[PDB]
């Protein structure tokens, strides 16, 4: 196994997957690393196993169908994985914790959103449909763009949004279009 965390690229107290070489901090993996479980498979492996059990799940899907799906375990997991892939980008630190809003010329958002609020939401089973998760995720980057306006700092929202959207398309097998 790795000598660093797969998410945050640092060494530390790591928990190693029993089916791939990946390693994780406790609260870096999503869900948080389960107490016992020997063997333990990480979320990368568990996502792989879905595909290897239903190879037609990689056939193209419409976004609109994906968003109405209930958050049964297999979709709960994909959201968890998608969230994790956003945390893997270092620029995610700008979106992790509760923001504040006090800039000349701008007003704060009506509904603030951040990645740890979304992680806690997934964790306490608050989302019933994929739709709900994807909306809060998109909200984070929408709120960022509206607040930083023309400051080049809005570029960070676009960059991390792109990481989210590419990974959404891959994980949920969206039909590839132009
Ligand atoms: Zn980590
Ligand atoms: Zn693994
Ligand atoms: Zn089947």
CB 87 within 8 A of CB 28: yes
Q: Which two tokens stand for residue 106?
A: 């701008």
Q: Which two tokens stand for residue 149?
A: 């306006």
What domains appear along the chain, each with residue ranges and CATH number?
1-59 (3.30.40.10), 60-178 (1.20.920.10)
Query: Can you tell me which residue has the tokens 């797969």?
Result: 6
Q: Which two tokens stand for residue 97?
A: 């914790």
- Give the C-alpha separation, 81 to 69, whole Å: 16
Q: Which residues surround ligand 1, an ion (CB under 5 A)?
A: 5, 7-8, 25, 28
Ligand nearest to the CA of 57: 3
Phi, psi of 94 (to 5 degrees): -65, -15
Q: Which two tokens stand for residue 170?
A: 């891959």
Resolution for this model in angstroms, one decimal place?
2.6
12: left (phi > 0), else alpha (psi -120 to 50), else beta?
A: left
Give the distance (Å) from ligand 2 centre to CA of residue 23. Answer: 8
- Give the burial class of 66: count Cβ atoms within 10 A of its Cβ; 0-12 exposed, 13-18 middle, 19 or more buried: buried
Ligand nearest to the CA of 29: 1
Q: Which two tokens stand for residue 113?
A: 């959103």
Looking at residue 58, the DSSP 8-state letter turns out to be G
- Give the C-alpha separation, 3 to 60, whole Å: 36
Give the distance (Å) from ligand 2 centre to CA of residue 25. Answer: 13
Ligand nearest to the CA of 87: 1
Give the SS3 label for residue 57.
Answer: helix
Cα angle 153, 146, 100; round to 5: 75
Provide CB contacts within 8 A for 148, sequence distance 6+: 103, 106, 154, 157
16 DSSP β-pair partners:
23
Ligand nearest to the CA of 54: 3
Give the SS3 label for residue 23.
Answer: strand
| CA distances from residue 82 to 52, 108, 118, 153, 154 in whole angstroms, order as listed | 19, 27, 12, 24, 22
Number of neighbouring beta carbons within 10 Å of residue 47 = 19
């Amino acid at each position: 196994n790795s000598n660093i965390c797969e998410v945050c690229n640092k060494w530390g107290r790591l928990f190693c997957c029993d089916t791939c070489p990946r390693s994780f901090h406790e609260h870096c993996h999503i869900p948080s690393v389960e107490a016992n479980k020997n063997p333990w498979s990480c979320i990368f492996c568990r996502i792989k196993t879905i595909q290897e059990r239903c190879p037609e799940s990689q056939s193209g899907h419409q976004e609109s169908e994906v968003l109405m799906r209930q958050m049964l375990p297999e979709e709960q997991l994909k959201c968890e994985f998608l969230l994790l892939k956003v945390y893997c980008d270092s620029k995610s630190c700008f979106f992790a914790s509760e923001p504040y809003y006090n800039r000349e010329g701008s007003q704060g958002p009506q509904k603030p959103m951040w990645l740890n609020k979304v992680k806690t939401s997934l964790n306490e089973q608050m989302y019933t449909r994929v739709e709900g998760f994807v909306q809060d995720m998109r909200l984070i980057f929408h709120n960022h763009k509206e607040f930083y306006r023309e400051d080049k700092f809005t570029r960070l929202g676009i960059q991390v949004q792109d990481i989210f959207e590419k990974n959404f398309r891959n994980i949920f097998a969206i039909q590839e279009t132009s």
